[PDB]
Amino acid sequence: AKLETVTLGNIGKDGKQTLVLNPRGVNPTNGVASLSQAGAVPALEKRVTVSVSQPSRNRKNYKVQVKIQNPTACTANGSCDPSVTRQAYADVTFSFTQYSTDEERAFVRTELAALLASPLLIDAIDQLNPAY
Amino acid sequence: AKLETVTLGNIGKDGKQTLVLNPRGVNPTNGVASLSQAGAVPALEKRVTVSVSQPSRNRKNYKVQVKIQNPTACTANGSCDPSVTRQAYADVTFSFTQYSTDEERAFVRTELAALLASPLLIDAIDQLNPAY
Amino acid sequence: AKLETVTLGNIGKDGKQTLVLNPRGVNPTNGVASLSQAGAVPALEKRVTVSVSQPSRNRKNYKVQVKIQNPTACTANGSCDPSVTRQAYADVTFSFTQYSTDEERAFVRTELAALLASPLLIDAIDQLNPAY
Amino acid sequence: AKLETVTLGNIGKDGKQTLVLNPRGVNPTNGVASLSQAGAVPALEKRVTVSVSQPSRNRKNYKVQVKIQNPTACTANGSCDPSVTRQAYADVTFSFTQYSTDEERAFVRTELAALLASPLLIDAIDQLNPAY
Amino acid sequence: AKLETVTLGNIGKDGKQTLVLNPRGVNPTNGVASLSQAGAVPALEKRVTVSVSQPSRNRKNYKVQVKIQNPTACSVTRQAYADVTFSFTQYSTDEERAFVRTELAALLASPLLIDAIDQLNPAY
Amino acid sequence: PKLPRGLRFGADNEILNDFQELWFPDLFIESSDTHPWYTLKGRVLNAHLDDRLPNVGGRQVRRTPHRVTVPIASSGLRPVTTVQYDPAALSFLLNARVDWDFGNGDSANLVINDFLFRTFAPKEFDFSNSLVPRYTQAFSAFNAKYGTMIGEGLETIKYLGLLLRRLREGYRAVKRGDLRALRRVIQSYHNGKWKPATAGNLWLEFRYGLMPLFYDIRDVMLDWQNRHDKIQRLLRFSVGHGEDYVVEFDNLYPAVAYFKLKGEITLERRHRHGISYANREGYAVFDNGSLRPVSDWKELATAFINPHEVAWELTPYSFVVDWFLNVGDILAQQGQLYHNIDIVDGFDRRDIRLKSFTIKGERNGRPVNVSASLSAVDLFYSRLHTSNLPFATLDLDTTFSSFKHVLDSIFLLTQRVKR
RNA sequence: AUAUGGCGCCUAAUUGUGAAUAAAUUAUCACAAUUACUCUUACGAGUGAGAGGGGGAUCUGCUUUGCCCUCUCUCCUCCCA
């Protein structure tokens, strides 16, 4: 899991924008690696945090956490510094047993991606229409 | 001290096996580098960890821990994937002063290595024979 | 696990010195055998203790403890008897299950040996360099 | 509430120094007034705080307190900022029974004034000598 | 009065050694320029401070002060120091000032003051 | 040109630090001779020699010019300066007294002065592998080593805010005008059912009727200043490791091939690195021309306890509102100390320093005896600014956002106070 | 059971002098000093670490040192009744 520049292509409603995320320092207090946009200011605006808690007397049950956070901002007519008027964000949480297999984890990843790609979730998020 | 594929050569009773530990990563929450045998199932990989603790206000001493983890497969004749049945541990704990020397501490290392090679420790570990 | 004179050669940074430890009396209060420098006084300076704890209510789960101590001493310019200025020490603790077997025990010990011999640990505590 | 200007005279051993104290306010908590010299500097301005109490619960006798500060104002101090070097404390405390008299209070008052004016207390306050 | 490196040659009992004094920061709290040994450590040991106090409500009467300080160590075990103070009136002339400087230098180089400084013997 | 080399102007003509020159200066070569002459005094082989010949042949060192900085933060932290001095060859004066009495009429005794020698300088070295590890553990124990003080500071500042809120309530009661309702706070300190005695007054029951409040305010704001001091001192992490490296100097002949001089020189090289932290927005443009001092912090606290104050009888309202406003000003000023705290500066330094030495003369049967003292002239010193930090940092923004929130809230509260 | 969780035991100490047994040690007690490294081991100096206090310390400073100034105290600790 080397940290470096991540180029997220074919994204958006029409799948034409691209996102470039550089890494930053990893949170020592809880071991969380972070990327943010290439910058400059949007680096401290958009964030992508990833952590993997390994087993313990509390963990059994590896837990992989993936948070994404996009602040929508703008500039008042007369102001200079943009203010954040909104905050979108999402959290993905995988829980795997110690006997889990890379096999299993991989198809899980791919199934989640394909579901996100499927029309169902497409309209369920894009339009917030429940399945009916 | 960059992490890297560690290939331990002749190994075991007759001295003919070999071990290949891939660098996993380094938990910074406690500053500990992790190595693991190449596999798929975390529960059945040979694991090793190294940490070096600097002298603090309540310690004031150099510490270095090396931990070694050897689970056994005990795969059943079908019916599901293998299950861990036994686990061998090794815990090595070097500790020195602020003023100690690379000389001293290399010397005591190679001392420990030679000791683990010597016939006494051989039967004191292998055969479980009390030192006498 | 017979006690007798132990000759560890190829010791130090360059692996050229040699250390000859003679045996001593087995501590009956806890059953611990011990070896010490050939002498005279260093016999009471540098120590290498061997312990084999058998199962019990508290144990399960044999243990084997190996504790090495090397006190660095010096003579003040004017004094006679050398006083200990620093002291180095290490402890290895092997824990084996009651069904453990010699093959795996030897596997573990020689793996410790090669790890100690590997670039990793040698850098990690000749220089106190966590793998980074 | 004391709001009176006091034009003092016969200050110092020579008796040719004069001083003026102008009110600065009242402290509506403990029945305390405040008076100062004309100026704008702590060291150059001498403090006079009189205070009068009445019985409430903790005590059954009056209290007339008087605290005078006569700081030594130095001219040459590296700039035009006359600071203080010797703080002159003068603390006077009285205690009168609720059945005393204005006659008795005036008696103690005049006796204090006369002793201060006489060459009795001058030798003990200025030259610092014991009663031979 | 530019501040720069000063090479004092022919100094000592027999006029052989040399002192290299490089300048430092002029003390803004009192406007005094400083020079110190070539270094490294002797820079904070040896000191030569120069100031020219112009007239004030207490001065009138320019006062040019030159202080020299030599600490001898082996921790500083001894400290020698000297101070020269020239007081010159406003109508004083540079003729007068150079006369005074040169006279004082010729005195310090004259036998009497070498006798009274080096061996510390009063003129008797 | 107007400002010194390492300075530049901003948008509104404000003094600012010129990063392009601070971090990427113009090196230049210099060959300024310091002591290009040596003097021998004494007698050698029955010949008194007191000439004065040169010793320096050729000099070349790269270095940076002189620069100036200005603090880029309220606490007064200054930015680091890139400096270089990498002489092609070292330099060490030797004021030795060579002398040796040989047989068959061969004696020598004299003293050398201003005699130097050039030798190799080991510039190629890097202890990054040894220094980088010594940050992770320090950061991990940091919160375990100062979380106590940080927490007590967080509670102290909230307690200050609470005190100011109660004071604001009292002042608003004063402004609206009421004698009995004004005692809402008076009942919060006496710990007792205080009864009235006569008809009081607004300003009278507020000027010192709140002495416990004033004492508490003074004490805990001095408390916060003291902890603040340490806390900002805690935003810097410098660590270095030193090692010894003995070197040999080529042969040299102070005289005309009359005796050889050899030996050894003991030096140590230490690699050091220091990481800092401060704001990530205004660090580049920090107004140094408009800020309040630190003494007024004590001034305001002691003002209400000062029993010398005439404005209580002319314009209580103005003085109290100014008290509020200046407190809010200082609070906002210190607020920037905790907004977006990240890596802002980083320097790496490599320096060589002598410790000891040895001298050995050898011309015929080891006849020379040397008893000298060594001193260096030129030492390798290279300090470079770096922005690439190849390791997990301790981003201290999340742990300070609370303090920033608190100060902003308190500033809003105090600025809300009107005449 | 690794990380770490639990159990127990333990704490300022070192050196020297008194008593110590008939005679020698001599723990217990008392008595006297020590406390971090380098420097002569003389006095004392330097540095690292921490603790506390005072100063209020930004404008055009140096820097072969990386950075608020200074005073005081400690080198098994800190806190309460």
Side-chain angles (χ1 to χ4, degrees):
Chain A
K2 182 175 173 183
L3 75 175
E4 69 275 16
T5 314
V6 187
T7 306
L8 279 297
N10 194 27
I11 54 179
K13 273 184 77 173
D14 291 327
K16 291 299 143 283
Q17 193 278 344
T18 307
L19 182 63
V20 176
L21 304 166
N22 74 14
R24 189 177 66 249
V26 189
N27 182 359
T29 56
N30 266 355
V32 192
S34 304
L35 320 174
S36 59
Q37 293 180 356
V41 176
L44 67 89
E45 289 322 317
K46 198 178 280 201
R47 302 145 66 99
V48 176
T49 67
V50 65
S51 182
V52 55
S53 58
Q54 63 84 30
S56 174
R57 273 187 323 293
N58 72 342
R59 300 284 63 71
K60 301 182 290 181
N61 189 359
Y62 285 53
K63 311 213 306 207
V64 176
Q65 297 67 4
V66 176
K67 305 189 189 297
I68 297 169
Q69 190 173 25
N70 308 335
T72 299
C74 82
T75 313
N77 288 340
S79 186
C80 186
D81 295 344
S83 64
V84 180
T85 300
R86 286 179 52 206
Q87 204 64 238
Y89 62 77
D91 176 11
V92 176
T93 311
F94 314 80
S95 294
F96 294 102
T97 186
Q98 62 184 356
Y99 296 111
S100 67
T101 74
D102 47 353
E103 294 293 328
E104 294 293 327
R105 301 186 276 263
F107 67 87
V108 165
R109 179 189 171 65
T110 56
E111 293 179 353
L112 187 144
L115 294 175
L116 294 167
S118 161
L120 191 146
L121 294 194
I122 282 287
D123 287 346
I125 312 301
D126 308 330
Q127 186 63 255
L128 276 296
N129 59 4
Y132 279 101
Chain B
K2 290 293 293 298
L3 301 173
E4 51 193 359
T5 49
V6 186
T7 302
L8 292 83
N10 295 330
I11 188 55
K13 289 184 79 176
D14 54 4
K16 289 199 288 286
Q17 294 82 17
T18 60
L19 184 57
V20 185
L21 294 174
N22 58 68
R24 274 205 72 71
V26 189
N27 295 326
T29 55
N30 208 2
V32 192
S34 172
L35 277 293
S36 303
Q37 186 182 294
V41 190
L44 273 295
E45 314 284 339
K46 306 301 186 183
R47 275 144 270 194
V48 178
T49 62
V50 178
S51 81
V52 181
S53 302
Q54 289 173 167
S56 75
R57 80 191 191 278
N58 299 325
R59 285 321 81 180
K60 312 150 280 302
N61 188 273
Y62 301 176
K63 196 58 206 70
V64 176
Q65 290 200 309
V66 186
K67 308 161 199 284
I68 308 90
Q69 294 304 50
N70 282 253
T72 298
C74 169
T75 310
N77 288 324
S79 290
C80 185
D81 313 298
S83 62
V84 55
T85 186
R86 321 195 316 209
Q87 180 63 254
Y89 290 164
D91 204 318
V92 178
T93 73
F94 295 0
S95 173
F96 303 135
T97 184
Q98 280 192 345
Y99 284 0
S100 182
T101 73
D102 67 332
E103 162 48 60
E104 300 147 352
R105 60 192 174 92
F107 183 77
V108 300
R109 286 176 173 172
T110 48
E111 272 180 345
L112 180 58
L115 290 158
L116 277 296
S118 61
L120 172 60
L121 294 201
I122 287 169
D123 287 337
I125 297 168
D126 186 79
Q127 304 305 306
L128 292 73
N129 280 316
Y132 182 76
Chain C
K2 181 173 178 179
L3 285 162
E4 65 183 1
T5 306
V6 185
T7 300
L8 314 174
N10 305 322
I11 188 69
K13 278 75 69 177
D14 192 4
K16 270 63 166 175
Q17 287 69 240
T18 311
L19 197 72
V20 184
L21 295 175
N22 64 357
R24 307 298 285 283
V26 183
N27 188 358
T29 62
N30 50 4
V32 188
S34 296
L35 320 170
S36 80
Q37 176 58 266
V41 171
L44 61 89
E45 302 172 346
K46 291 186 168 67
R47 285 331 310 260
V48 178
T49 62
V50 178
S51 178
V52 188
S53 290
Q54 318 291 293
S56 181
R57 295 174 299 291
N58 55 9
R59 303 289 62 69
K60 249 169 198 169
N61 189 359
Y62 282 77
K63 299 201 297 178
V64 192
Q65 185 146 51
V66 184
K67 174 102 181 73
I68 62 170
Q69 208 86 5
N70 286 290
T72 300
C74 65
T75 313
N77 292 346
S79 186
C80 189
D81 291 345
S83 65
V84 173
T85 177
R86 296 189 287 285
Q87 293 203 19
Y89 67 102
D91 194 17
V92 181
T93 301
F94 292 164
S95 43
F96 292 164
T97 192
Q98 200 264 337
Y99 287 105
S100 53
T101 75
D102 58 327
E103 302 82 7
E104 293 82 3
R105 305 192 276 277
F107 190 72
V108 175
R109 69 183 169 81
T110 54
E111 281 185 349
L112 182 63
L115 294 174
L116 182 62
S118 160
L120 187 153
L121 294 174
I122 62 172
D123 197 27
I125 191 167
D126 277 333
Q127 293 77 14
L128 315 167
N129 277 52
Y132 275 87
Chain D
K2 305 297 192 293
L3 296 169
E4 311 170 356
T5 298
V6 188
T7 301
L8 166 56
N10 314 127
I11 297 299
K13 288 190 178 62
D14 297 329
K16 295 190 180 297
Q17 294 292 109
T18 60
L19 298 168
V20 289
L21 290 163
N22 318 311
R24 302 284 297 274
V26 183
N27 291 138
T29 61
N30 188 10
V32 176
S34 295
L35 284 76
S36 295
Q37 298 171 282
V41 180
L44 293 163
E45 281 184 343
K46 284 169 192 292
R47 179 79 199 223
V48 179
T49 63
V50 299
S51 179
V52 285
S53 68
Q54 70 92 33
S56 179
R57 43 141 280 181
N58 312 72
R59 277 88 175 196
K60 304 290 195 292
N61 298 323
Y62 285 136
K63 309 193 290 181
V64 177
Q65 298 185 354
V66 176
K67 272 81 159 170
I68 309 96
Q69 303 291 304
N70 290 340
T72 308
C74 182
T75 306
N77 294 114
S79 65
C80 184
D81 289 324
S83 303
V84 59
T85 312
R86 279 95 70 194
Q87 187 58 249
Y89 293 99
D91 201 0
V92 175
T93 55
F94 297 103
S95 172
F96 298 97
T97 310
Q98 300 166 186
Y99 292 104
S100 297
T101 59
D102 299 329
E103 184 275 332
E104 185 68 28
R105 288 202 286 287
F107 178 79
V108 55
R109 180 173 52 70
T110 60
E111 193 167 358
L112 266 296
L115 285 148
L116 294 166
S118 288
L120 183 63
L121 294 174
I122 196 169
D123 302 333
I125 292 159
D126 293 330
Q127 299 298 108
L128 195 156
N129 294 118
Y132 310 153
Chain E
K2 314 308 155 285
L3 292 165
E4 51 200 359
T5 303
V6 184
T7 297
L8 319 172
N10 286 326
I11 54 170
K13 271 184 75 166
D14 304 329
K16 286 177 178 177
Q17 285 90 54
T18 310
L19 184 65
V20 186
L21 302 173
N22 53 302
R24 305 285 296 288
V26 176
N27 189 358
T29 58
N30 53 8
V32 185
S34 298
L35 322 167
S36 62
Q37 180 157 12
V41 175
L44 62 87
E45 295 176 346
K46 299 192 180 59
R47 291 192 176 76
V48 183
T49 61
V50 182
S51 190
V52 181
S53 296
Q54 309 275 291
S56 178
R57 277 192 274 283
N58 54 330
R59 283 81 57 85
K60 290 185 180 178
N61 166 19
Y62 286 67
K63 193 179 283 187
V64 187
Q65 287 191 311
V66 181
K67 308 183 189 290
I68 292 163
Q69 188 186 31
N70 279 278
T72 307
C74 62
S75 60
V76 175
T77 179
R78 295 179 299 288
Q79 295 196 12
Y81 46 102
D83 188 15
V84 187
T85 306
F86 312 99
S87 299
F88 296 123
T89 194
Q90 293 178 232
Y91 292 167
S92 51
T93 75
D94 76 338
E95 277 192 354
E96 292 177 357
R97 301 196 287 281
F99 272 130
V100 164
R101 186 176 68 73
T102 52
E103 288 292 6
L104 187 56
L107 271 166
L108 286 164
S110 162
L112 186 67
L113 292 175
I114 72 174
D115 305 335
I117 284 157
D118 301 335
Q119 285 276 324
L120 310 155
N121 289 331
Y124 272 81
Chain F
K2 304 167 203 292
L3 294 165
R5 187 195 272 286
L7 277 296
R8 70 183 160 207
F9 293 93
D12 64 54
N13 210 326
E14 69 276 16
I15 305 302
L16 291 169
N17 290 316
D18 196 352
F19 287 85
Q20 189 280 332
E21 194 279 330
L22 178 61
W23 297 347
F24 303 108
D26 180 358
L27 284 169
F28 71 91
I29 311 98
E30 184 48 52
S31 69
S32 294
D33 46 0
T34 58
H35 300 275
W37 49 77
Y38 66 92
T39 61
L40 271 72
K41 287 186 179 175
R43 171 272 328 283
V44 63
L45 303 168
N46 192 359
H48 291 82
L49 295 165
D50 197 357
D51 295 332
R52 304 178 39 270
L53 266 71
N55 49 3
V56 169
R59 209 179 85 71
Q60 184 179 0
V61 66
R62 300 157 310 296
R63 60 175 292 173
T64 62
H66 188 93
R67 288 90 62 72
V68 175
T69 62
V70 66
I72 55 164
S74 64
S75 73
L77 184 144
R78 284 177 175 282
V80 176
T81 59
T82 301
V83 179
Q84 192 63 251
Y85 197 82
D86 177 19
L90 307 167
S91 299
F92 315 89
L93 175 61
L94 183 63
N95 192 352
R97 293 167 179 173
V98 65
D99 58 358
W100 49 277
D101 182 358
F102 204 78
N104 60 52
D106 273 328
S107 177
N109 196 6
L110 61 86
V111 62
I112 299 148
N113 300 293
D114 291 331
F115 190 79
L116 71 83
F117 55 94
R118 276 97 179 263
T119 68
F120 182 78
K123 187 269 183 182
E124 201 276 0
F125 61 100
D126 178 2
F127 306 153
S128 297
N129 62 6
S130 176
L131 277 296
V132 68
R134 307 181 68 190
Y135 281 104
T136 56
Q137 48 275 30
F139 301 148
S140 85
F142 178 74
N143 58 24
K145 288 156 44 52
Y146 317 88
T148 59
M149 283 73 74
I150 290 155
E152 53 87 19
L154 180 66
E155 283 321 317
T156 51
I157 189 70
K158 285 295 209 189
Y159 169 105
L160 277 296
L162 188 153
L163 295 174
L164 274 298
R165 181 163 38 273
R166 294 177 325 146
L167 182 63
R168 179 168 181 281
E169 192 205 349
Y171 169 73
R172 193 176 72 262
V174 168
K175 178 179 75 176
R176 200 91 77 176
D178 49 0
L179 302 167
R180 188 174 56 216
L182 178 53
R183 304 164 189 170
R184 290 320 179 151
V185 292
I186 297 287
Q187 286 298 119
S188 303
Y189 308 79
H190 285 91
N191 309 115
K193 287 179 181 181
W194 182 255
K195 285 185 173 65
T198 187
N201 262 325
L202 296 163
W203 292 271
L204 265 55
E205 299 280 29
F206 211 78
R207 186 177 163 175
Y208 293 99
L210 289 77
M211 182 254 265
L213 168 55
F214 307 139
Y215 270 96
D216 291 331
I217 293 157
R218 181 185 57 71
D219 197 359
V220 177
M221 183 179 71
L222 272 71
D223 189 358
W224 163 230
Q225 187 184 1
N226 283 316
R227 281 84 170 93
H228 173 93
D229 292 331
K230 295 174 178 180
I231 290 157
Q232 299 92 38
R233 283 300 310 101
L234 261 69
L235 272 291
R236 288 213 269 186
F237 314 129
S238 179
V239 70
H241 193 76
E243 310 84 330
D244 184 344
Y245 183 67
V246 67
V247 189
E248 181 65 26
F249 64 110
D250 76 18
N251 287 319
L252 61 83
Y253 299 79
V256 177
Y258 294 162
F259 54 107
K260 277 73 69 177
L261 299 173
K262 299 157 302 319
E264 203 76 25
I265 294 159
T266 311
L267 53 80
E268 65 287 0
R269 68 218 168 295
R270 67 175 63 67
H271 192 64
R272 195 178 183 75
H273 198 283
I275 303 162
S276 300
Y277 273 88
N279 179 355
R280 286 274 296 97
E281 289 81 37
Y283 79 107
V285 185
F286 185 68
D287 175 358
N288 273 309
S290 66
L291 79 166
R292 292 192 68 76
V294 193
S295 62
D296 189 358
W297 181 299
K298 304 184 176 183
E299 183 178 1
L300 295 160
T302 301
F304 298 167
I305 187 76
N306 281 325
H308 276 326
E309 200 299 332
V310 65
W312 307 131
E313 289 65 69
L314 281 293
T315 176
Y317 278 104
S318 179
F319 182 76
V320 66
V321 299
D322 304 337
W323 190 82
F324 292 161
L325 294 156
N326 294 317
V327 167
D329 182 358
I330 297 161
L331 294 174
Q333 180 145 290
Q334 65 183 357
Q336 65 84 21
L337 162 77
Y338 269 17
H339 199 63
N340 207 335
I341 301 299
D342 193 345
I343 301 294
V344 296
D345 200 358
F347 64 90
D348 53 1
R349 181 252 284 156
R350 303 140 195 253
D351 50 346
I352 316 183
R353 313 290 181 130
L354 70 92
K355 271 163 76 174
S356 66
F357 64 95
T358 309
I359 306 165
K360 205 53 52 193
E362 314 178 354
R363 52 203 292 285
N364 284 321
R366 186 267 183 275
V368 189
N369 284 316
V370 298
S371 60
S373 177
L374 183 63
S375 168
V377 176
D378 305 330
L379 293 171
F380 173 83
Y381 202 103
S382 65
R383 183 184 62 196
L384 307 175
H385 172 76
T386 182
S387 70
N388 181 352
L389 277 69
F391 67 114
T393 73
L394 173 55
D395 60 357
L396 295 174
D397 192 8
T398 176
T399 188
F400 299 157
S401 62
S402 181
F403 293 89
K404 166 59 61 159
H405 188 194
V406 173
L407 287 164
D408 294 324
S409 74
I410 297 169
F411 171 79
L412 292 164
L413 180 66
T414 304
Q415 63 83 30
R416 261 294 323 282
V417 185
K418 274 69 171 175
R419 289 173 182 281

